[PDB]
Design a protein around this ligand. Structure first.
Ligand SMILES: CCCCCCCCCCCCCCCCCC(=O)OC[C@H](COP(=O)([O-])OCC(O)COP(=O)([O-])OC[C@@H](COC(=O)CCCCCCCCCCCCCCCCC)OC(=O)CCCCCCCCCCCCCCCCC)OC(=O)CCCCCCCCCCCCCCCCC
Ligand SMILES: CCCCCCCCCCCCCCCCCC(=O)OC[C@H](COP(=O)([O-])OCC(O)COP(=O)([O-])OC[C@@H](COC(=O)CCCCCCCCCCCCCCCCC)OC(=O)CCCCCCCCCCCCCCCCC)OC(=O)CCCCCCCCCCCCCCCCC
Ligand SMILES: CCCCCCCCCCCCCCCCCC(=O)OC[C@H](COP(=O)([O-])OCC(O)COP(=O)([O-])OC[C@@H](COC(=O)CCCCCCCCCCCCCCCCC)OC(=O)CCCCCCCCCCCCCCCCC)OC(=O)CCCCCCCCCCCCCCCCC
Ligand SMILES: CCCCCCCCCCCCCCCCCC(=O)OC[C@H](COP(=O)([O-])OCC(O)COP(=O)([O-])OC[C@@H](COC(=O)CCCCCCCCCCCCCCCCC)OC(=O)CCCCCCCCCCCCCCCCC)OC(=O)CCCCCCCCCCCCCCCCC
Ligand SMILES: CCCCCCCCCCCCCCCCC[C@@H](O)O[C@H](CO[C@H](O)CCCCCCCCCCCCCCC)COP(=O)(O)OCC[N+](C)(C)C
Ligand SMILES: CCCCCCCCCCCCCCCCC[C@@H](O)O[C@H](CO[C@H](O)CCCCCCCCCCCCCCC)COP(=O)(O)OCC[N+](C)(C)C
Ligand SMILES: CCCCCCCC/C=C\CCCCCCCC(=O)OC[C@H](COP(=O)(O)OCCN)OC(=O)CCCCCCC/C=C\CCCCCCCC
Ligand SMILES: CCCCCCCC/C=C\CCCCCCCC(=O)O[C@H](COC(=O)CCCCCCC/C=C/CCCCCCCC)COP(=O)(O)OCCN
Ligand SMILES: N[C@@H](Cc1ccc(O)cc1)C(=O)O
Lengths: 458, 53, 122, 347, 56, 104, 69, 55, 140
C-alpha cells in the first residue's frame, strides 16, 4: 500500500517548496486527492485480509479508519488557516509538516503487520501531537496539558513493550497472522494475569478508561482546533483498534479479567454523562462526551462477541466524525467571542441561522437519532450487553437518557434564548466554516446509506 | 574493548611478562614452572568455559 | 557476554574477512543504501541551515559530498552486517547438525487427534 | 596554555585510553589509567579559576582512590593465581574490589557524587571530553571481564544509577549538572546489560556518545550554561533551538528517534534471559529523565521567553568558529532507528 | 512565458508522481511473493495454451 | 517606571469583510481567497464526495454474499430433494476424528 | 471497476500463502537460535562464547639451570 | 469530589509529590568531599560483606 | 546478609510465628542500621548523642515495622489455614505501613504506606510462588 504512503511523504516537500501564499490551496487539494485514492481500500473480502506485503496489510477494521484519517487531514487544514493568518511562512509550513507527519504515522500504524512496528508507530504519533499542543495552544495551561498527555500515555505503553518482546521470545513471532493462527490459551497464573495487564493497560489509557481519563479534558481543551479534531476523531481509536487486535491472545483470561474494567466503563459512562450536565466550558463538555462514548466502546470490546465488535467499529467511526464536527462548531463561536464560556454568547440562532442548523444536526447525531450509524453502533453494543447480562439495560438505559439531555442542553444554551446585548462583533458565517460543517456531516448520512462499510471484519 | 593490535601486527608489546613460564633471563625457572606449563597446555584452545571444568 | 569475539580463525581488526567474498553484495539500489544517502542529504541541509545559508541551494558540491560519503560508508557497513548474520546462521545450523540429541524431530500429530480445551464465550 | 602543549596533553589522554584498550597485561592497563589521569588533570584546569581548581582536585582524589583499589585487586588476583593476563579474574574478593574501582572511575551510583560537581566546575569543552571520552577505558575493561562479574552487585549499581540520575536531574537549573545526571543514568543503562551482552553495551555507549556530542556542541554554539541564558537563544537563532528540541526528545528515548533504539534493544536482551522486573523498572524510571528534558524543551524551544534590548546588537554578527561535525552528529542523534539491524556489525 | 508558470506550479506533480511510484513499488513487492503461484490446492489450474503465469 | 517590561499592545482582530465584502473567509488576498474556495468546493464535493460515493456504491461483490446465497440455495434444494436434514450439528466428519481411548 | 482497479482472489490467496510460509519459518528459526544460544553458553563447546585462554606458544621449552625446571 | 480532587490526588499528584521529594533528598548535598568519601567507605564495606562474602 | 534472609525463609509460612517475627525484626533492624549509617555520613548530626538518637529512632522504626509485618503475616496464614496465599503478605504489609504511619504520627503516611507496602509484599509472595527472578543469571 505504498500508493498511499508515498503521496503523503510527497506532500511534505510540496509544502516546503510551495509559494508563500499557496500552501493551504496545494495542501488541501492534494490531501483530498489522497483521500480519494485511499477510498479504494474499502473493497474487502469475506474470508481474510488484503495482505499487500510482508510489512503492510489491510483488514475490514482498519480500512474505514484509514479513510477517516485521510479525510480528516483536509478538514484540519481548512479549520486551521483562519487563526494562523498572522503566523510567519516558516511556522505555517512547520504546522502543516506536523499534520502531515501525524497522518503518515497513523496510516502506517493502522496497517502494520507486526506488533512491534505497530507499537513504534503508535508511540511515534506522540511527538507531533505534543508539539502542536504545546507550541500552538492559546493559554498557559497547554504546557501542563502536554505533560499530562505524554506521561499518562507512556506509563501505559512501557509495560506493553516489555510484554511484547517477552511474547516474541516465547512464540517466536509477533506477526499478527501467525499470532492468530498459532493461538494458545492463557492459563490462570499470576504471571499470565500481569501479562494480560501489560497487554491491556496502554490501550485502556488511550481510550481512555474512566479513572485514567484526566489527561483528556486538559489536552483536548488546551489544544488548537486541528489538534482537538485529530485527538478526538482518530487518536482515541488507536486504543480500540489495538485492543481488538491484542485480545486474540488473551483468552480465556479475559473471561474474568474484564470485570473491573467493565464496571469502571459502565459506571464511569454514567458519571461522565452526568458531568456533562454541569459544565461551564463548551469544549470540556465535548471532551467528556467523548469519554462516555469510548466507555461504551470499551464495554463492547471487553465482552468479545461479533455483535459487540461490529457495534464498536461503527461507534468509533461515527464518534470520530461527530466529535470533530462539534469541536469545529465550538471553535467558530470561540473565534468570534474569544471565550469558551458557554453562557457568554446566547441566542445565536437569531444571528446565525445556518450555523444553528449545523448545531442541531451535530447534536442530533450526538444523541444517536435513528437511523444514524451512531445509533447503529450504540444499539448493537446494547444488544450484546443485554445478552451478556440482562441488568446492563439499566445502566445503558440511564446513559441514553442523560446523553440527550446534556446534548440538547448545549444546543439550548447556545442557540436559543435571547442574544447577549453587549456582544456586537458577531459577523456572518464565512463560506469556509459552512463548507467545513457540510464536509463533516454529509459523509455521516452517506455512511448510513451503506452501513456494512463501517461494521468491521465480523 | 580489546583491540588485539599485538596479534594483528605480531608485535609482542607485553605478552613476554604475562606468565612465569615464558623465557626468563638466564633461563632462571619459576618455582611452579611445570605446574603452570601443564595447566596452560591443558587449557589451550578449548575456551574458558570448558577449561574451568 | 561476548558471542563472537573468540570465534576460531577471527582476524583481530579485519572488518571484512575473505570468506565474506562468497556472499552476494548488496545492490546499489538497496533501500538501506537509499536511506543512508537520505541521511547524508539531511546532514547537508542541516549544515546549510546552521550556517545561515539558503538551505536547498547554498552548496551543491558540499551536499553531493555528504550524500556520497554516507552512501560509501553504508555500502561497507551493509556488507559487514550481512556477513555477520550469515556467520550466525552457519554456526547455528552446524551446531544443530552436530548435536542431534538436543534437537529431536518428534512425531507429528494432526488436529483430529489433539484434544484442545474449548472455552465458550458467554 | 600553549596550543602545542594542549595538543600534547589531549594526545596523552587518548594514548592512555588506547593503552588500556590494546593491553593484555594488567600492569599496562593500570599504566594507561595513570597516564590518562595525569594528562587529564591540566585539561580540566585550562581556564584557571577557583571552581576549576576545586573540580580538578575532587576529580584527582576520586580517580587516585579508584586506581589504588584497582592495583590492589590486581595484586590479590596475582597472589591467588600467578596470572597477569586480563581474564576471568580467578579470585572473587579481587573481582569485587575491581568492580568497585571501575564503578568509582565511571561515576556509577553510589560513587556518583563527583560527576555533577566536576562537570559544573569546568568548561563546556572539558565537560564534553569528560562525559564522552573518559568512559571508554573502564567500560572496555568491564567488557573484557564480564564473564566473571557478579550480576547482583552490578545490577544493583545500575538500578541505583538510573534512579539517582533521574531524581538528581529533576532538581537542576544548570545545564552542566543536567548533563552529568543524564550521564549517570545512561551509565546505569549501559552497565545493566553488560553481564548479558557486551554488544548492547557498546551500542548504547555509541548512541549516548553521539547524542552527548550533539548536545554539548549545540550548547557551545549558543553560549548558554543556564536555563535562563538558553531561553534567549530563540531570539538570536531559532534553528539551533529547534535542533536542540529534537535532540532532547531523542535523548528522552521517544520513538521513532534514535535514542529509543538502545533501551529497546537492551529490554529485549533482558527478556531473552528471564529478567522481567528490572527492565520494566528501568523504563519507568527513565521517564524522569524524559520529564526534565521536556522541561528544558519547554523553556528553550516550545515557548518564547522575554529577551533584552542589547540582543539587537548580536543580530548584526555571525558565528565565527564553525563545528564541522555538528550536522552529522545531529542527524545520527535523531534519524538512525531504521538502520537498527546494522548493530550486528558491532560483535 | 511558460517559465514563470512552471516555476510557480511545478510542485503539483510531486504527489501524482509519488502515487505512480508507489504503484510501481507495490507491483515490485508483489513480484517477490510468487512462491505459491498456481500451487494452492484450491486454485491450482492447468495453464492455457498461451498464457505463461496465472497472475502477475 | 511602574512597568515590568516593554511589550507590544494586544492588537484588535481584523474583519475580513471590511476590505472584501464578499470574502469567503479563506484569505485576505481576494484572488487567492476565491481560488481557495473554488478548489475546496470542486475537490471536496464534486470529486471526492459524489464520485467516491458512486465508486463505493458499485464496488464488486468480493464479500461473496450472492455466491453464498446461491450455494445455500443449491444445498437446500439437494437436501430437501433427498430427504436429508438441512443442517448437521457436526461440521467435521467424525471418521476423521480420533477421540481419546479412555474416559475413565 | 473489477477489471480496471483489482485483481482476482487467487493473487491475494497465494501471496498470503507465501507470506505465511516466510513468517512461520522465521519464527521457527528464532526459537532454534534461542535454544542454540542457551546450549552454547551452558557448555562452551561451540564457536560462540569462546573465552580466551593462555597461548601455549608462550612457554619456553629450554633447560632451566635446574634439572627439575 | 472525584474528577477534580481524588482522581487527581491518587495517580498524578501523588507521583509528582513523591518524585519531587526524592529529587530534593538526592540532589541537596553540600559538596563536601568528607561526607561522601565517608559514604564511599560505607559502600565499600557493605559491598564486601553483603555481596562478596556470598559467592 | 543472606543468613538473615535464609533464617526468615527457612521457617514454613503458617508455623512458629514467634520465630518468624524475630527473624523479620532482625532484618528490619539491619536495614535501619544501614539507613542510619548513610544518613549520618551524608547529613552530620552536629553531636554524637544526636547521632545515637537518630540511629536509635531509625532502627527502632525499621525493627518495629519488620516485627509487625512478620507477626501479622504468620498469624493470618495460620488462622486462615491458607499458606501460599498473597493475601497474608498484603495484610502484613498494610500492618507494617500503619505501624510506620503511627511511628511518624501522620495519617496520610499511614494510608499510603499501608497501600504500597501491602501491594509490594503481595508482589513478593507472587514472585516466590511463580519463580520470578529479580537478578536473573545469564542464560543466553
Ligand atoms: C518518516 C518518513 C520520512 C520523514 C523524514 C524525517 C523528516 C524530514 C527530514 C528531516 C531533515 C530535513 C531538513 C533538515 C534541514 C531543515 C532545517 C531548517 O531550518 O529548514 C528551513 C528551510 C527553509 O529555510 P530557507 O528556505 O533558507 O528560508 C527560510 C528562512 O530560513 C527562515 O528560517 P528561520 O530560521 O528564520 O525560522 C525559524 C524556524 C526554523 O526552525 C526550523 O525550521 C525547524 C527545522 C528543524 C530540523 C529538524 C530537526 C532534525 C531532524 C529530525 C526530525 C525527526 C523526525 C521524526 C519525527 C519526530 C518529529 C520531531 O524556527 C521556528 O520558527 C520555531 C518553530 C517551533 C516548532 C518546533 C518544531 C521543530 C521540530 C520539527 C521537525 C520535523 C521534521 C522536519 C520539518 C521540516 C523542516 C524544514 O526548510 C527547507 O526549505 C528545507 C526542507 C525542504 C527541502 C527538501 C526538498 C527536496 C527537493 C524537492 C523535491 C523532492 C524529491 C522527491 C523525489 C521525486 C522527484 C520528483
Ligand atoms: C524487605 C527487606 C529489606 C528491604 C531493603 C530495601 C528497602 C530499604 C528502605 C529504606 C529507605 C531509606 C530511604 C527513605 C527514607 C527517607 C530518609 C530518612 O532518613 O527519613 C527517615 C524518616 C523519618 O525521619 P525524618 O528525619 O523525619 O526525615 C526527614 C528528612 O527529610 C530526611 O532526611 P534528609 O532528607 O535530609 O536525607 C538524609 C539522607 C539519608 O540517606 C539515606 O538514607 C541513604 C538511603 C540508603 C537506604 C538503603 C539501605 C537498605 C539496604 C538493605 C540491605 C540488606 C539489609 C538486611 O538522604 C540523602 O542524602 C539521599 C542521597 C542519596 C545518595 C545515595 C547513597 C545511598 C547508597 C545506596 C543505597 C544503599 C547501598 C547498599 C549497597 C550498595 C552496593 C551496590 O522515616 C524513617 O524513619 C524510616 C527510616 C528507615 C525505615 C525503612 C523501612 C524498612 C522496613 C523493612 C521491614 C522488614 C520486612 C520483613 C522482611 C521479610
Ligand atoms: C579491604 C577494603 C576495606 C577497607 C576498609 C576497612 C579498614 C579498617 C581500618 C580501621 C582502623 C582505623 C584507622 C584510622 C581511621 C581514620 C579515622 C579518622 O581519621 O577520623 C576522621 C574523622 C573526622 O575527624 P575530625 O574532623 O577532626 O573530627 C570531627 C568530629 O569527630 C565530629 O564532629 P561533629 O561533632 O560536628 O559531628 C557529630 C558526630 C556524630 O557522631 C555520630 O553520630 C556517631 C554515633 C552513631 C551511633 C552508632 C550506633 C550505635 C549502635 C550500633 C551498633 C551496631 C552493632 C549492634 C547492632 C545494634 C545493637 C542493638 O560526628 C559525625 O557526624 C561524623 C560521622 C562519623 C561516624 C562514624 C563513621 C563510620 C560510618 C558511619 C556509621 C554511622 C553509625 C550508624 C550505625 C552503623 C553501624 C555502627 O573522625 C571521625 O569521624 C570520628 C573518629 C573515628 C575513629 C575511630 C573509628 C574508625 C573507623 C574505621 C572503620 C571501623
Ligand atoms: C475510578 C473511581 C474512583 C476511584 C478513586 C476514588 C475513591 C478512592 C479515593 C478517595 C478515598 C481514599 C482516601 C483514603 C484515606 C485518606 C486519608 C488521608 O488522606 O490522610 C491525610 C489526612 C491529613 O490529616 P493529618 O494532617 O495527618 O492530621 C489531621 C487529621 O485530619 C485529624 O484527624 P482527626 O483527629 O480529626 O480524626 C482522625 C481519626 C478519626 O476521624 C474522625 O475524627 C471522624 C471519623 C472518621 C473515621 C471513620 C471510621 C468509622 C466509620 C467507617 C464505617 C465503615 C466504612 C464504610 C464501608 C461500609 C462497608 C459495608 O481517624 C483515625 O484515627 C484513623 C483510624 C482508622 C479508622 C478508619 C479507617 C477504616 C478503613 C476502611 C476499611 C474498609 C475495608 C474494605 C471494606 C469492603 C466493603 C465495602 O488525614 C485526614 O485528615 C483523614 C483522617 C481519617 C481518614 C480515614 C478514613 C478512611 C476512608 C475509607 C478508605 C477506603 C479507601 C482506601 C482503601 C484501599 C487501601 C488498601
Ligand atoms: C483508577 C483505575 C485504574 C485502572 C483499573 C485497572 C484494574 C486492575 C484490577 C485487577 C483485576 C484482578 C487482578 C487479579 C485477579 C484476581 C485478584 C484477587 O483479588 O482474586 C483472588 C486472589 O486471592 C487473593 O485476593 C490474593 C490477592 C491479594 C493481594 C492483591 C492486592 C489487592 C489489594 C488492592 C490494591 C489496589 C490495586 C490497584 C492500585 C491502583 C482470587 O483467588 P485465587 O484463586 O487464589 O487467585 C487467582 C490467581 N491464581 C489462580 C494464580 C491463584
Ligand atoms: C548514533 C549512530 C551511531 C554511529 C557511530 C559512529 C559511525 C561512524 C564511525 C565509522 C567507523 C569506522 C570503522 C571502519 C574502519 C575499520 C575498523 C575495523 O577494523 O574494526 C573492526 C570492528 O568493526 C566495527 O566495530 C564496526 C563499526 C560500525 C558501527 C556501526 C553500528 C551502529 C549500530 C546501528 C545504528 C545505525 C548506524 C548508521 C551509520 C551511519 C574490527 O573488529 P574487532 O577488532 O574484532 O572488534 C573489537 C571489539 N570487540 C572484539 C570486543 C568486538
Ligand atoms: C520508582 C520511580 C518511578 C518513576 C515514575 C516517574 C513518573 C514520570 C513523571 C515524572 C513527573 C515529575 C514531576 C515532578 O516531580 O515535579 C513536580 C512538578 C513541579 O513542576 P516543575 O515543572 O518541575 O517546576 C516548574 C516551575 N518551577 O509539579 C507538577 O505540577 C508536575 C506537572 C506535570 C506532572 C505530570 C505527571 C503525570 C503522571 C501520570 C501518571 C504516570 C505516573 C508514572 C507511574 C505510573 C504507575 C506505574
Ligand atoms: C497512568 C497509569 C498507567 C498504568 C499502567 C501500568 C500497569 C501495567 C501492568 C503492570 C506491568 C507488569 C508486566 C510486565 C511484563 C509482563 C510479561 C510477563 O509475562 O512476565 C511474567 C512475569 O510477571 C512479572 O514478573 C510481573 C510482576 C510485576 C512486577 C512489576 C510490578 C508493577 C506494578 C504492579 C501493580 C500494578 C499493575 C496494575 C496497574 C493498573 C493500572 C493502574 C512471566 O515471567 P516468568 O518469570 O518467565 O514466569 C514464568 C517463570 N517464573
Ligand atoms: N462482520 C460482518 C460485517 C457485515 C455486516 C453487514 C453486512 O451486510 C455485511 C457484512 C460480516 O458478516
Amino acid at each position: 500500500m505504498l500508493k498511499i504512503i508515498i503521496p503523503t511523504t510527497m506532500l511534505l516537500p510540496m509544502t516546503w517548496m510551495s509559494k508563500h501564499n499557496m500552501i493551504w490551496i496545494n495542501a488541501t487539494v492534494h490531501s483530498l486527492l489522497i483521500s480519494l485514492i485511499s477510498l479504494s481500500l474499502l473493497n474487502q473480502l469475506g474470508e481474510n485480509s488484503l495482505n499487500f506485503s510482508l510489512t503492510f496489510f489491510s483488514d475490514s477494521l482498519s480500512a474505514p479508519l484509514l479513510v477517516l484519517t485521510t479525510w480528516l487531514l483536509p478538514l484540519m487544514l481548512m479549520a486551521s488557516q483562519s487563526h494562523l493568518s498572522k503566523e510567519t511562512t516558516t511556522r505555517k509550513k512547520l504546522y502543516i509538516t506536523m499534520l502531515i507527519l501525524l497522518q503518515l504515522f497513523l496510516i502506517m500504524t493502522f496497517t502494520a503487520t507486526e506488533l512491534i512496528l505497530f507499537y513504534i508507530l503508535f508511540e511515534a504519533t506522540l511527538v507531533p501531537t505534543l508539539i502542536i499542543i504545546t507550541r500552538w495552544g492559546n493559554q498557559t495551561e497547554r504546557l501542563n496539558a502536554g505533560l499530562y498527555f505524554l506521561f499518562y500515555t507512556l506509563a501505559g505503553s512501557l509495560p506493553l513493550l516489555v510484554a511484547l518482546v517477552y511474547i516474541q521470545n516465547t512464540t517466536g513471532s509477533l506477526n499478527f497472522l501467525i499470532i492468530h493462527y498459532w493461538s494458545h490459551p492463557l492459563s490462570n497464573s499470576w504471571s499470565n494475569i500481569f501479562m494480560w495487564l501489560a497487554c491491556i493497560m496502554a490501550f485502556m489509557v488511550k481510550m481512555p478508561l474512566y479513572g485514567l481519563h484526566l489527561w483528556l479534558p486538559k489536552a483536548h481543551v488546551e489544544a488548537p482546533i486541528a489538534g482537538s479534531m485529530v485527538l478526538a476523531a482518530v487518536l482515541l481509536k488507536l486504543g480500540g483498534y489495538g485492543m481488538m487486535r491484542i485480545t486474540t491472545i488473551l483468552n480465556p483470561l479475559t473471561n474474568y479479567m474484564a470485570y473491573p474494567f467493565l464496571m469502571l466503563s459502565m459506571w464511569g459512562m454514567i458519571m461522565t454523562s452526568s458531568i456533562c450536565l454541569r459544565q461551564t466550558d463548551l469544549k470540556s463538555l465535548i471532551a467528556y462526551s467523548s469519554v462516555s462514548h469510548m466507555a461504551l466502546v470499551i464495554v463492547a470490546i471487553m465482552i468479545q462477541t461479533p455483535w459487540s465488535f461490529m457495534g464498536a467499529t461503527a461507534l468509533m467511526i461515527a464518534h470520530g466524525l461527530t466529535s470533530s464536527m462539534l469541536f469545529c462548531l465550538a471553535n467558530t463561536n470561540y473565534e468570534r467571542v474569544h471565550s469558551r464560556t458557554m453562557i457568554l454568547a446566547r441566542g445565536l440562532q437569531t444571528l446565525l441561522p445556518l450555523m444553528a442548523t449545523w448545531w442541531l444536526v451535530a447534536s442530533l447525531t450526538n444523541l444517536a437519532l435513528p437511523p444514524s450509524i451512531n445509533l447503529i453502533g450504540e444499539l448493537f453494543i446494547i444488544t450484546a450487553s443485554f445478552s451478556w447480562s440482562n441488568i446492563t439495560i439499566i445502566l445503558m438505559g440511564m446513559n441514553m437518557m442523560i446523553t440527550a439531555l446534556y446534548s440538547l442542553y448545549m444546543l439550548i444554551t447556545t442557540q436559543r434564548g435571547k442574544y447577549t446585548h453587549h456582544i456586537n462583533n458577531i459577523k456572518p458565517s464565512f463560506t469556509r466554516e459552512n463548507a467545513l460543517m457540510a464536509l463533516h456531516i454529509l459523509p455521516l448520512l452517506l455512511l448510513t446509506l451503506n452501513p456494512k462499510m463501517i461494521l468491521g471484519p465480523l | 574493548p580489546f583491540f588485539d593490535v599485538q596479534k594483528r601486527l605480531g608485535l609482542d608489546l607485553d605478552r613476554w611478562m604475562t606468565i612465569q613460564s615464558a623465557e626468563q633471563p638466564h633461563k632462571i625457572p619459576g618455582r611452579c614452572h611445570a605446574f603452570e606449563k601443564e595447566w596452560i597446555e591443558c587449557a589451550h584452545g578449548i575456551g574458558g568455559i570448558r577449561a574451568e571444568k | 557476554m561476548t558471542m563472537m569475539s573468540g570465534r576460531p580463525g577471527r582476524v583481530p581488526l579485519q572488518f571484512l574477512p575473505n570468506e565474506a567474498r562468497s556472499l552476494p553484495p548488496p545492490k546499489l539500489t538497496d533501500p538501506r543504501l537509499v536511506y543512508m544517502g537520505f541521511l547524508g542529504y539531511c546532514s547537508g541541509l542541516i549544515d546549510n541551515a546552521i550556517r545561515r545559508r539558503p538551505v536547498v541551494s547554498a552548496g551543491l558540491h558540499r551536499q553531493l559530498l555528504y550524500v556520497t560519503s554516507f552512501v560509501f560508508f553504508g555500502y561497507y557497513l551493509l556488507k559487514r552486517q550481512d556477513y555477520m548474520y550469515a556467520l550466525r546462521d552457519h554456526d547455528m545450523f552446524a551446531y544443530v547438525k552436530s548435536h542431534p540429541e538436543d534437537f529431536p524431530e518428534k512425531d507429528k500429530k494432526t488436529y483430529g487427534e489433539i484434544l484442545e480445551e474449548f472455552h465458550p464465550v458467554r | 596554555m600553549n596550543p602545542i602543549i594542549y595538543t600534547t596533553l589531549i594526545m596523552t589522554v587518548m594514548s592512555g585510553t588506547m593503552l588500556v584498550m590494546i593491553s593484555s597485561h594488567w600492569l599496562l592497563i593500570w599504566i594507561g589509567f595513570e597516564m590518562n589521569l595525569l594528562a587529564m588533570i591540566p585539561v580540566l584546569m585550562k581556564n584557571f579559576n577557583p571552581r576549576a581548581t576545586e573540580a580538578a582536585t575532587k576529580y584527582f582524589l576520586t580517580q587516585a582512590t579508584a586506581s589504588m583499589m584497582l592495583m590492589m585487586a590486581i595484586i590479590i588476583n596475582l597472589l591467588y593465581s600467578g596470572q597477569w593476563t586480563i581474564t576471568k579474574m580467578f579470585n572473587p574478593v579481587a573481582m569485587t574490589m575491581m568492580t568497585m574501582a571501575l564503578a568509582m572511575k565511571l561515576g556509577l551510583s553510589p560513587f556518583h557524587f563527583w560527576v555533577p560537581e566536576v562537570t559544573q566546575g569546568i568548561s563546556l569543552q572539558a565537560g564534553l571530553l569528560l562525559l564522552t571520552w573518559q568512559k571508554l577505558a573502564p567500560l572496555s575493561v568491564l567488557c573484557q571481564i564480564s564473564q566473571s562479574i557478579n550480576p547482583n552487585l552490578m545490577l544493583t549499581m545500575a538500578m541505583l544509577s538510573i534512579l539517582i540520575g533521574g531524581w538528581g536531574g529533576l532538581n537542576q537549573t544548570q545545564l552542566r549538572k543536567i548533563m552529568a545526571y543524564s550521564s549517570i543514568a545512561h551509565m546505569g543503562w549501559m552497565t545493566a546489560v553488560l553481564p548479558y551482552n557486551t554488544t548492547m553495551t557498546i551500542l548504547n555507549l555509541l548512541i549516548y556518545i553521539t547524542m552527548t556530542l550533539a548536545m554539548f556542541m549545540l550548547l557551545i554554539h549558543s553560549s548558554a550554561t543556564t536555563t535562563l541564558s538558553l531561553s534567549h537563544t530563540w531570539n538570536k537563532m531559532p534553528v539551533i533551538t529547534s535542533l536542540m528540541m529534537v535532540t532532547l526528545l531523542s535523548m528522552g528515548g521517544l520513538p521513532p528517534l534514535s535514542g529509543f533504539m538502545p533501551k529497546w534493544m537492551i529490554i529485549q536482551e533482558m527478556t531473552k534471559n528471564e529478567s522481567i522486573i528490572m527492565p520494566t523498572l528501568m523504563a519507568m524510571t527513565a521517564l524522569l529523565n524524559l520529564y526534565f528534558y521536556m522541561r528544558l524543551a519547554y523553556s528553550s524551544s516550545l515557548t518564547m521567553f522575554p529577551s533584552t534590548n542589547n540582543m539587537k546588537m548580536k543580530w548584526q554578527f555571525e558565528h565565527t568558529k564553525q563545528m564541522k561535525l555538528l550536522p552529522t552528529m545531529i542527524v545520527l542523534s535523531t534519524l538512525v532507528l531504521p538502520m537498527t539491524p546494522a548493530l550486528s556489525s558491532l560483535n | 512565458n511558460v517559465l514563470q508558470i512552471v516555476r510557480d506550479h511545478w510542485v503539483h506533480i510531486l504527489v501524482p508522481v509519488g502515487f505512480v511510484f508507489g504503484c510501481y513499488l507495490d507491483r515490485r513487492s508483489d513480484e517477490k511473493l510468487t512462491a505459491f503461484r498456481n500451487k494452492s490446492l484450491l486454485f491450482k489450474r492447468e495453464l492455457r495454451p498461451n498464457e505463461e503465469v496465472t497472475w502477475k | 517606571p511602574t512597568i515590568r517590561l516593554q511589550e507590544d499592545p494586544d492588537p484588535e482582530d481584523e474583519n475580513l469583510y471590511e476590505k472584501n465584502p464578499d470574502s469567503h473567509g479563506y484569505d485576505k488576498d481576494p484572488i487567492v481567497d476565491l481560488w481557495n474556495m473554488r478548489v475546496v468546493f470542486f475537490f471536496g464535493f464534486s470529486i471526492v464526495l459524489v464520485l467516491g460515493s458512486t465508486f463505493v456504491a458499485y464496488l464488486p461483490d468480493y464479500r461473496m454474499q450472492e455466491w453464498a446465497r446461491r450455494e445455500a440455495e443449491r444445498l437446500v434444494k439437494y437436501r430437501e430433494a433427498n430427504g436429508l436434514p438441512l443442517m448437521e450439528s457436526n461440521c467435521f466428519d467424525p471418521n476423521k476424528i480420533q477421540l481419546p481411548e479412555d474416559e475413565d | 471497476i473489477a477489471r480496471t482497479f483489482y485483481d482476482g482472489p487467487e493473487k491475494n490467496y497465494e501471496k498470503t500463502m507465501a507470506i505465511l510460509q516466510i513468517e512461520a519459518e522465521k519464527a521457527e528459526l528464532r526459537l532454534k537460535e534461542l535454544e542454540v544460544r542457551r546450549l552454547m553458553r551452558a557448555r562452551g563447546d561451540g564457536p560462540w562464547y569462546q573465552y580466551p585462554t593462555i597461548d601455549k606458544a608462550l612457554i619456553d621449552h629450554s633447560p632451566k639451570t635446574t634439572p627439575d625446571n | 469530589l472525584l474528577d477534580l480532587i481524588w482522581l487527581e490526588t491518587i495517580l498524578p499528584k501523588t507521583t509528582s509529590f513523591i518524585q519531587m521529594k526524592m529529587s530534593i533528598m538526592v540532589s541537596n548535598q553540600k559538596g563536601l568531599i568528607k561526607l561522601y568519601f565517608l559514604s564511599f567507605l560505607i559502600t565499600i564495606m557493605i559491598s564486601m560483606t553483603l555481596f562478596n562474602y556470598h559467592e | 546478609a543472606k543468613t538473615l534472609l535464609h533464617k526468615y525463609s527457612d521457617i514454613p509460612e503458617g508455623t512458629e510465628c514467634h520465630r518468624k517475627a524475630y527473624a523479620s525484626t532482625s532484618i528490619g533492624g539491619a536495614t535501619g542500621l544501614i539507613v542510619s549509617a548513610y544518613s549520618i555520613a551524608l547529613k552530620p548530626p552536629a553531636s554524637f548523642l544526636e547521632g545515637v538518637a537518630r540511629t536509635g529512632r531509625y532502627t527502632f522504626t525499621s525493627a518495629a515495622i519488620g516485627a509487625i509485618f512478620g507477626l501479622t503475616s504468620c498469624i493470618s496464614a495460620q488462622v486462615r489455614e491458607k499458606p501460599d496465599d498473597p493475601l497474608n503478605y498484603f495484610i502484613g504489609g498494610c500492618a507494617g505501613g500503619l505501624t510506620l504511619g503511627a511511628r511518624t504520627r501522620s495519617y496520610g503516611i499511614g494510608a499510603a504506606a499501608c497501600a504500597y507496602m501491602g501491594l509490594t509484599a503481595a508482589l513478593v509472595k507472587m514472585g516466590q510462588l511463580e519463580g520470578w527472578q529479580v537478578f536473573a543469571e545469564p542464560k543466553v
